Design a protein around this motif. Sequence first.
Motif, PDB file in Angstrom:
ATOM      1  N   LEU A 182       9.747 -10.977  14.569  1.00 46.49           N
ATOM      2  CA  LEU A 182       8.956 -11.029  13.491  1.00 46.49           C
ATOM      3  C   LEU A 182       9.844 -11.763  12.259  1.00 46.49           C
ATOM      4  O   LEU A 182      10.973 -11.542  11.933  1.00 46.49           O
ATOM      5  CB  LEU A 182       8.679  -9.935  13.208  1.00 46.49           C
ATOM      6  N   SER A 183       8.979 -12.097  11.302  1.00 41.57           N
ATOM      7  CA  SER A 183       9.360 -12.604  10.107  1.00 41.57           C
ATOM      8  C   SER A 183       9.300 -11.490   9.256  1.00 41.57           C
ATOM      9  O   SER A 183       8.711 -10.461   9.551  1.00 41.57           O
ATOM     10  CB  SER A 183       8.580 -13.622   9.308  1.00 41.57           C
ATOM     11  N   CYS A 184      10.427 -11.065   8.340  1.00 41.38           N
ATOM     12  CA  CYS A 184      10.346  -9.832   7.645  1.00 41.38           C
ATOM     13  C   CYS A 184       9.024  -9.521   6.790  1.00 41.38           C
ATOM     14  O   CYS A 184       8.669  -8.621   6.327  1.00 41.38           O
ATOM     15  CB  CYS A 184      11.775 -10.023   6.786  1.00 41.38           C
ATOM     16  N   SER A 185       8.334 -10.845   6.409  1.00 38.45           N
ATOM     17  CA  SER A 185       7.134 -10.718   5.653  1.00 38.45           C
ATOM     18  C   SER A 185       6.078  -9.888   6.326  1.00 38.45           C
ATOM     19  O   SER A 185       5.347  -9.114   5.758  1.00 38.45           O
ATOM     20  CB  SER A 185       6.597 -12.078   5.381  1.00 38.45           C
ATOM     21  N   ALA A 186       6.216  -9.932   7.759  1.00 28.06           N
ATOM     22  CA  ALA A 186       5.399  -9.162   8.410  1.00 28.06           C
ATOM     23  C   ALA A 186       5.431  -7.477   8.363  1.00 28.06           C
ATOM     24  O   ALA A 186       4.417  -6.784   8.465  1.00 28.06           O
ATOM     25  CB  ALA A 186       5.545  -9.270  10.229  1.00 28.06           C
ATOM     26  N   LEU A 187       6.517  -7.123   7.863  1.00 28.19           N
ATOM     27  CA  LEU A 187       6.970  -5.788   7.582  1.00 28.19           C
ATOM     28  C   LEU A 187       6.511  -5.340   6.102  1.00 28.19           C
ATOM     29  O   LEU A 187       6.926  -4.371   5.635  1.00 28.19           O
ATOM     30  CB  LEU A 187       8.312  -5.436   7.751  1.00 28.19           C
ATOM     31  N   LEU A 188       5.886  -6.143   5.345  1.00 29.65           N
ATOM     32  CA  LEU A 188       5.477  -5.974   3.941  1.00 29.65           C
ATOM     33  C   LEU A 188       3.742  -5.924   3.830  1.00 29.65           C
ATOM     34  O   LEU A 188       3.068  -5.924   2.726  1.00 29.65           O
ATOM     35  CB  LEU A 188       5.935  -7.147   3.157  1.00 29.65           C
ATOM     36  N   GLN A 189       3.126  -6.044   5.036  1.00 30.38           N
ATOM     37  CA  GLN A 189       1.773  -5.861   4.807  1.00 30.38           C
ATOM     38  C   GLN A 189       1.314  -4.436   4.826  1.00 30.38           C
ATOM     39  O   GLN A 189       1.949  -3.601   4.956  1.00 30.38           O
ATOM     40  CB  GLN A 189       1.150  -6.388   6.457  1.00 30.38           C
ATOM     41  N   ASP A 190       0.027  -4.466   4.494  1.00 31.89           N
ATOM     42  CA  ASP A 190      -0.679  -3.146   4.276  1.00 31.89           C
ATOM     43  C   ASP A 190      -0.874  -2.553   5.688  1.00 31.89           C
ATOM     44  O   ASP A 190      -1.064  -1.291   6.181  1.00 31.89           O
ATOM     45  CB  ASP A 190      -2.006  -3.207   3.496  1.00 31.89           C
ATOM     46  N   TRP A 192      11.601   9.430   3.083  1.00 31.27           N
ATOM     47  CA  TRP A 192      12.733   9.080   2.485  1.00 31.27           C
ATOM     48  C   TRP A 192      13.071   7.676   2.344  1.00 31.27           C
ATOM     49  O   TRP A 192      13.774   7.185   1.372  1.00 31.27           O
ATOM     50  CB  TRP A 192      13.842   9.871   2.908  1.00 31.27           C
ATOM     51  N   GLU A 193      12.572   6.946   3.256  1.00 31.51           N
ATOM     52  CA  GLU A 193      12.968   5.456   3.389  1.00 31.51           C
ATOM     53  C   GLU A 193      12.178   4.652   2.043  1.00 31.51           C
ATOM     54  O   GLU A 193      12.716   4.139   1.321  1.00 31.51           O
ATOM     55  CB  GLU A 193      12.801   4.649   4.503  1.00 31.51           C
ATOM     56  N   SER A 194      10.857   4.787   1.987  1.00 31.42           N
ATOM     57  CA  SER A 194       9.973   3.957   1.339  1.00 31.42           C
ATOM     58  C   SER A 194       9.121   4.846   0.287  1.00 31.42           C
ATOM     59  O   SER A 194       8.654   4.425  -0.539  1.00 31.42           O
ATOM     60  CB  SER A 194       9.340   3.161   1.954  1.00 31.42           C
ATOM     61  N   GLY A 195       8.929   6.246   0.355  1.00 29.99           N
ATOM     62  CA  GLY A 195       7.905   6.961  -0.139  1.00 29.99           C
ATOM     63  C   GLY A 195       6.644   6.657   0.348  1.00 29.99           C
ATOM     64  O   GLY A 195       5.556   6.493  -0.418  1.00 29.99           O
ATOM     65  N   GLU A 237      -2.863  10.839   5.661  1.00 27.16           N
ATOM     66  CA  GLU A 237      -3.530   9.491   5.998  1.00 27.16           C
ATOM     67  C   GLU A 237      -2.656   8.886   6.902  1.00 27.16           C
ATOM     68  O   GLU A 237      -2.958   8.439   8.054  1.00 27.16           O
ATOM     69  CB  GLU A 237      -3.745   8.629   4.674  1.00 27.16           C
ATOM     70  N   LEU A 238      -1.216   8.541   6.733  1.00 27.52           N
ATOM     71  CA  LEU A 238      -0.144   8.124   7.324  1.00 27.52           C
ATOM     72  C   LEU A 238       0.126   8.865   8.515  1.00 27.52           C
ATOM     73  O   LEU A 238       0.308   8.286   9.693  1.00 27.52           O
ATOM     74  CB  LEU A 238       0.922   7.828   6.499  1.00 27.52           C
ATOM     75  N   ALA A 239       0.109  10.170   8.540  1.00 25.92           N
ATOM     76  CA  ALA A 239       0.314  11.047   9.840  1.00 25.92           C
ATOM     77  C   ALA A 239      -0.683  10.522  10.898  1.00 25.92           C
ATOM     78  O   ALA A 239      -0.453  10.350  11.777  1.00 25.92           O
ATOM     79  CB  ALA A 239       0.297  12.476   9.324  1.00 25.92           C
ATOM     80  N   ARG A 240      -2.012  10.618  10.398  1.00 29.62           N
ATOM     81  CA  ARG A 240      -3.056  10.240  11.259  1.00 29.62           C
ATOM     82  C   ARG A 240      -2.758   8.658  11.877  1.00 29.62           C
ATOM     83  O   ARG A 240      -3.168   8.573  13.071  1.00 29.62           O
ATOM     84  CB  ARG A 240      -4.619  10.534  10.876  1.00 29.62           C
ATOM     85  N   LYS A 295       0.774  -1.135  -0.116  1.00 34.20           N
ATOM     86  CA  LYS A 295      -0.039  -0.108   0.175  1.00 34.20           C
ATOM     87  C   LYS A 295       0.983   1.308  -0.081  1.00 34.20           C
ATOM     88  O   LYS A 295       1.980   1.231   0.508  1.00 34.20           O
ATOM     89  CB  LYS A 295      -0.963  -0.002   1.140  1.00 34.20           C
ATOM     90  N   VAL A 296       0.570   2.279  -0.785  1.00 38.34           N
ATOM     91  CA  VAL A 296       1.150   3.375  -0.889  1.00 38.34           C
ATOM     92  C   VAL A 296       0.401   4.531  -0.129  1.00 38.34           C
ATOM     93  O   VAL A 296      -0.814   4.794  -0.660  1.00 38.34           O
ATOM     94  CB  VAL A 296       1.711   4.059  -2.174  1.00 38.34           C
ATOM     95  N   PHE A 297       0.816   5.104   0.986  1.00 35.27           N
ATOM     96  CA  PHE A 297      -0.085   6.019   1.986  1.00 35.27           C
ATOM     97  C   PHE A 297      -0.029   7.297   1.542  1.00 35.27           C
ATOM     98  O   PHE A 297       1.197   7.681   0.749  1.00 35.27           O
ATOM     99  CB  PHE A 297       0.394   5.857   3.214  1.00 35.27           C
ATOM    100  N   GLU A 298      -1.185   8.153   1.612  1.00 26.08           N
ATOM    101  CA  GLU A 298      -1.150   9.407   1.247  1.00 26.08           C
ATOM    102  C   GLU A 298      -0.690  10.222   2.610  1.00 26.08           C
ATOM    103  O   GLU A 298      -0.828   9.448   3.709  1.00 26.08           O
ATOM    104  CB  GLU A 298      -2.603   9.849   0.849  1.00 26.08           C
TER     105      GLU A 298
END
Length: 130
Positions: A79-87, A34-37, A7-10, A1-4
């Motif tokens: 954590l499995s690194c997969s967990a860091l790829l969820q929406d 800067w890390e992921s946009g 939306e992310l701030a909240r 997911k690409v947050f606006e």
Amino acid sequence: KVFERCELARTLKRLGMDGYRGISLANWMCLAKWESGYNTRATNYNAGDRSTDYGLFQINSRYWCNDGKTPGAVNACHLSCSALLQDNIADAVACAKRVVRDPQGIRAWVAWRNRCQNRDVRQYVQGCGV
């Protein structure tokens, strides 16, 4: 997911990131930008040391999460690194909190030093209502 942006701030504020270990919400926003946009599925392989950076905060597999293929790695966030790829960024936030609990704090990410440190980071949260 690409947050606006807002939306992310909240979302981050609701997850208790504002002022966590002395780090303002605007700093966390600058870091994610800067890390992921603001992209949760972003992955970056570091050919130089065989580790991979995962997700919104580009958390490294050598110390924080387990991906099974990184040599001499620990998994401090348990954590499995997969967990860091969820929406759903709940797990990524809990791990980001773990990272800054170490002496370096937010400085653990070199992108933060280069693009956020000593700068006016107000722009990242302006108008978001947080």
